[PDB]
């Protein structure tokens, strides 16, 4: 298989759909991945990528993160939740991510983008929430640990909501660095978790980084604020950690056009191209992006285009607001205790 960008998609993930078939009444809908896929087709980006076949995760693979009971309950269906197809679709999302992750980790592909639903980052050990059932990215990381002896994994979560599930999965593990940029507003946004002072536990202390933006939408966060977060917090810590593989929980709901509580921020789709490019400089370019949140179809299609374009190696000022500066300072202050690059902050 050609050493280029990988894509994974599967039409059976469209069948995690309520029988009413409405986008309106359920914002995590089939049209999210359908629209991204055709956008990558239309722009000729699919033709420059290796499109790999996906599969269902085994119950055993799901049990690297979730309890047996949870994997039986949402991973099998004897006689939104589609009573026929959701169990299969949720398993497909995990297995598609896993397949792409391994091809990149082994050197078979350069990098990749997983066009998957339902999303994963809110799913805890025994609890689904936020339209997530199994944590696809966490399962893929665990499998890298158990089947490829990957010593250091960076998980970057740039979905605008905190990935409570992923934080839980690796909270005591120093070999996985979980790094979330999210709207936090002192605990008063969705889900409500992800404080800057949650740094990990036991051997994992210092290896959970919550880049929690606080101060609400006054003014709302934008390109300059995320670029500054990347320059002052994300990349210094990510570089010092020196990961062997990068996984990105890539929600696009920070993009302009997501009203609160689905978003509230003013990132441009282009900015995600620039963030992707910055993460590609780590881990010998071994990076996989998996779709998490993001609702508005033009926003997520634009941001996907810019990420996949950046992954292929193509190409395409302002001070950060006082709320953002205060937020970054709170994080740097906490993490000065654990990271040499922030010792003097």
Ligand X SMILES: Cc1ncc(-c2ccc([C@H](C(=O)NO)c3ccccc3F)cc2)cn1
Residue 124 binds ligand X (CB under 6 A): no
Instruction: Report residue 340 as tokens.
Output: 């040499």
Q: Which is nearer to ligand X, 27 or 313 (CB)?
A: 27
Interface residue with ligand X among 75, 130, 215, 243 (CB under 6 A) is 130
- Cis peptide leading into 280, omega within 30 of 0? no
Residue 74 binds Na ion (CB under 5 A): no
Interface residue with Na ion among 9, 102, 207, 230 (CB under 5 A) is 207
Residue 198 binds Na ion (CB under 5 A): no
Residue 119 binds ligand X (CB under 6 A): yes
Distance CA 216, CA 15 (A): 36
Helix residue spans in the chain (DSSP H): 31-42, 59-62, 68-75, 86-105, 136-147, 164-169, 223-229, 235-241, 269-280, 297-311, 322-335
Interface residue with Na ion among 50, 173, 292, 305 (CB under 5 A) is 173
Interface residue with ligand X among 18, 174, 190, 270 (CB under 6 A) is 190
Instruction: Report residue 7 as tokens.
Output: 């894509």
Q: How many C-beta atoms lie closer than 10 Å to residue 43's C-beta?
A: 15
Q: Is 49 annotated as a binding residue?
A: no
CB of 290 to ligand X, least distance (A): 12
Instruction: Report residue 145 as tokens.
Output: 């640990």
Residue 223 binds ligand X (CB under 6 A): no
Residue 293 binds Na ion (CB under 5 A): no
Instruction: Report residue 25 as tokens.
Output: 């009444």
Most distant pair of Cα atoms in the chain: their distance: 61
Interface residue with Zn ion among 200, 215, 236, 293 (CB under 5 A) is 293
Angle between helices 86-105 and 68-75 (to 10 degrees): 120
Question: Which one of the spans 167-175, 264-272, 287-295, 324-332 is the region binding ligand X (CB under 6 A)?
Answer: 287-295
Q: Is 18 annotated as a binding residue?
A: yes
Q: What is the DSSP letter of 321?
A: P
CB of 256 to ligand X, least distance (A): 15
- Cis peptide leading into 158, omega within 30 of 0? no
Q: Is the dihedral of CA 337, 288, 271, 297 positive or negative?
A: negative
Is 122 a known active-site residue? Answer: yes
Q: Which is nearer to Na ion, 109 or 155 (CB)?
A: 155
Q: Is 20 annotated as a binding residue?
A: yes
Q: Give contact residues for ligand X (rule: CB under 6 A).
A: 27-28, 119, 122, 130-131, 159, 161, 190, 251, 253, 261-262, 292-293, 295
Please list the active-site residues.
122
Q: Give contact residues for Na ion (rule: CB under 5 A).
A: 170, 173, 176, 204, 207
């Amino acid at each position: 298989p050609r050493f280029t960008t990988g894509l994974v998609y599967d039409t059976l993930m469209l069948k995690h759909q309520c029988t009413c078939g409405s986008s309106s009444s359920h914002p995590e809908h089939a049209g999210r991945i359908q629209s991204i896929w055709s956008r990558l087709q239309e722009t000729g980006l699919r033709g420059k990528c290796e499109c790999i076949r996906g599969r269902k995760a085994t119950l055993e693979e799901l049990q690297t993160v979730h309890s047996e009971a949870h994997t039986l309950l949402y991973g099998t269906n004897p006689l939104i939740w589609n009573e026929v197809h959701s169990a299969g679709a949720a398993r497909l999302a995990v297995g598609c991510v896993v397949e792409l992750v391994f091809k990149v980790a082994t050197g078979e592909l350069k990098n990749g983008f997983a066009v998957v639903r339902p999303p994963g980052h809110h799913a805890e050990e025994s609890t689904p929430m936020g339209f997530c059932y199994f944590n696809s990215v966490a399962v893929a990381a665990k499998l890298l640990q158990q089947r490829l002896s990957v010593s250091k994994i960076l998980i970057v979560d740039w979905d605008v909501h905190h990935g409570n599930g992923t934080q839980q999965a690796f909270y005591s593990d120093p070999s996985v660095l979980y790094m979330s940029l999210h709207r936090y507003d002192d605990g008063n946004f969705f889900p409500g978790s992800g404080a800057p002072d949650e740094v990990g536990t036991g051997p994992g202390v210092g290896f959970n980084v919550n880049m929690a933006f606080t101060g609400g939408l006054d003014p709302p966060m934008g390109d300059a604020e995320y670029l500054a977060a990347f320059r002052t917090v994300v990349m210094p810590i990510a570089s010092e950690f020196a990961p062997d593989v990068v996984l990105v929980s890539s929600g696009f709901d920070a993009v302009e056009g997501h009203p609160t509580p689905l978003g509230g921020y003013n990132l441009s789709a282009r900015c995600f191209g620039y963030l992707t490019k910055q993460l590609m400089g780590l881990a010998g370019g071994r990076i996989v992006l998996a779709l998490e949140g993001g609702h508005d179809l033009t926003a997520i299609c634009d941001a996907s285009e810019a990420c996949v374009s950046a992954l292929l190696g193509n190409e395409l000022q302002q001070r950060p607001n006082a709320n953002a500066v205060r937020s970054m300072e709170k994080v740097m202050e906490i993490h000065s205790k654990y990271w040499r690059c922030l010792q003097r902050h």
